[PDB]
Amino acid sequence: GVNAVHWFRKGLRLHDNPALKECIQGADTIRCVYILDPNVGINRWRFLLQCLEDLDANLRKLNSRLFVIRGQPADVFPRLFKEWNITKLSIEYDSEPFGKERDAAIKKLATEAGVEVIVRISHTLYDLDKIIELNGGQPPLTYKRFQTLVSKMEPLEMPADTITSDVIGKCMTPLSDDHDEKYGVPSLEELGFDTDGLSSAVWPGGETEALTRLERHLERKAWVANFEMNANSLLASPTGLSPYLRFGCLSCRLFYFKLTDLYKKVKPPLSLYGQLLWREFFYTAATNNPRFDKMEGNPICVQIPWDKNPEALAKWAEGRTGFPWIDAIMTQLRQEGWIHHLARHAVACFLTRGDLWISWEEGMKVFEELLLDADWSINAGSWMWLSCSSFFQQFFHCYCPVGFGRRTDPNGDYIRRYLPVLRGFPAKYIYDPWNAPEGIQKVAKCLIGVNYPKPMVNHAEASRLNIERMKQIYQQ
Numbered sequence: 001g002v003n004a005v006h007w008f009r010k011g012l013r014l015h016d017n018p019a020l021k022e023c024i025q026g027a028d029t030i031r032c033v034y035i036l037d038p039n040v041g042i043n044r045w046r047f048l049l050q051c052l053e054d055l056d057a058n059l060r061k062l063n064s065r066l067f068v069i070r071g072q073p074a075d076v077f078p079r080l081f082k083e084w085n086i087t088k089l090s091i092e093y094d095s096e097p098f099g100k101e102r103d104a105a106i107k108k109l110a111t112e113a114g115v116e117v118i119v120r121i122s123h124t125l126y127d128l129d130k131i132i133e134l135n136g137g138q139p140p141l142t143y144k145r146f147q148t149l150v151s152k153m154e155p156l157e158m159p160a161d162t163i164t165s166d167v168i169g170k171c172m173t174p175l176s177d178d179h180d181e182k183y184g185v186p187s188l189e190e191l192g193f194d195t196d197g198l199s200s201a202v203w204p205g206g207e208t209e210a211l212t213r214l215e216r217h218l219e220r221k222a223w224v225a226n227f228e229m230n231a232n233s234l235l236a237s238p239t240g241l242s243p244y245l246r247f248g249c250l251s252c253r254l255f256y257f258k259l260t261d262l263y264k265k266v267k268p269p270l271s272l273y274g275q276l277l278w279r280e281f282f283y284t285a286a287t288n289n290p291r292f293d294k295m296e297g298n299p300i301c302v303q304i305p306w307d308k309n310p311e312a313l314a315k316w317a318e319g320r321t322g323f324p325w326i327d328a329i330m331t332q333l334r335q336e337g338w339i340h341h342l343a344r345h346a347v348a349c350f351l352t353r354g355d356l357w358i359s360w361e362e363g364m365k366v367f368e369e370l371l372l373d374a375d376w377s378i379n380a381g382s383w384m385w386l387s388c389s390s391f392f393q394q395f396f397h398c399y400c401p402v403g404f405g406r407r408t409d410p411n412g413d414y415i416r417r418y419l420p421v422l423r424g425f426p427a428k429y430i431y432d433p434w435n436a437p438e439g440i441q442k443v444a445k446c447l448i449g450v451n452y453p454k455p456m457v458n459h460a461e462a463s464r465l466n467i468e469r470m471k472q473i474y475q476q
């Protein structure tokens with residue numbers, strides 16, 4: 001008699017799920033559980049709930065259900081193991097340090113109850129511990145070294161077979177009459193969110209949406225882009241995949257295999273999988289470093305004397321800096337949950353080494369709240385990279401908070417879109433409205449300093465001083 005539980009955390013999908021697949025074989029019963037207890041904003045929570053709704057719908061097609069349990073894993077699992085006579089628990093492996101800690105605690109609870117624990121890798125292409133072992137026990141802090149080590153790995157695992165009725169076979173899911181009340185997927189309102197002024201999501205969550213986008217994304221790559229940021233790129237794309245990769249609606253391995261297959265048929269260079277390998281790079285760097293998201297106590301982070309300035313930080317996080325390019329980017333972020341990678345560079349440089357001299361830790365927390373694709377490893381890694389705090393990054397140049405926006409969207413339509421208060425300004429002044437004469441401000445029906453703030457710093461001087469201060473941290 002084998003009674004199994006598969007615990008969803010990431011990997012919110014039925015395709016390429018080796019842990020769920022392995023759990024199901026030889027089992028008599030199976031139940032898939034998600035555990036949630038009622039720094040995450042409404043867009044991230046809405047995405048998660050839509051993922052869980054899609055999972056429950058797809059399990060329903062298999063004569064099963066998703067079980068959503070409200071609580072803490074260490075508090076709910078002991079009695080669950082007992083009630084359901086559980087003998088096997090499966091999880092997709094979590095390389096991140098806090099998830100490792102949580103999973104080690106559950107493993108000991110499982111052992112005490114005589115429960116076998118199955119762990120399989122499917123959030124990353126590679127076994128990250130084997131990369132670290134290859135490198136002598138420390139992760140590589142350069143991309144080229146990472147590539148070299150990966151080229152000595154065994155060829156990659158192919159994705160596992162989707163969970164179907166055939167896979168499930170004679171295994172089944174016992175279902176109680178009270179299932180939809182006791183184990184049902186929560187609502188935003190039940191989590192405490194006012195959904196009064198809530199437009200529908202720019203980024204619908206779920207495996208079904210992810211796989212649809214994946215197909216269209218490949219057609220676009222071959223047919224339209226031919227495998228090769230402008231005003232268009234700043235706006236969300238219907239074939240963008242990154243929030244689905246972060247939540248695990250889309251397998252990174254399935255994506256990788258589909259990309260290689262598409263290229264083979266139609267026509268590979270590393271640029272074909274550039275994005276996916278940077279993902280593995282930061283996970284690898286983070287896995288053995290519990291202070292990866294901190295400056296102090298973080299052995300890979302340069303110690304830099306950042307300022308504490310809650311007023312400036314709040315202006316940055318709420319898009320009230322008086323620099324329209326920065327404010328529009330931070331507005332799209334809060335409203336929609338995604339901004340272009342190069343827009344992230346711009347606002348991150350502004351907050352840290354370029355202008356405000358505020359610690360990268362603070363920007364990382366705002367991004368963790370608002371960015372759908374901001375998993376902990378890549379977010380902390382990127383903020384250290386941008387602030388010149390690790391990965392041997394140097395302060396060569398500083399993004400201009402006027403000129404970069406002006407070069408990406410010369411017309412300023414992006415500004416007019418997210419900062420409609422500035423819609424009346426001509427392109428000559430749209431990125432530096434404080435330089436507009438009062439008469440232009442009067443026709444635009446926007447008095448700078450009254451209806452839209454004046455710039456919070458002088459960029460030419462703040463950047464000059466900042467570059468100086470960073471230079472002198474190092475021996476000249």
Ligand SMILES: N#Cc1cccc(Cl)c1NC(=O)Cn1c2ccccc2c2ccccc21
Pocket residue numbers: 275278279341342344345348367373374375378379381382383385386
């Ligand atoms: N990929 C990659 C990569 C590779 C090398 C260097 C950097 Cl900074 C990289 N990050 C980006 O380009 C964009 N990016 C950011 C930029 C600034 C701050 C946070 C983020 C962030 C968070 C989650 C996901 C992508 C993110």
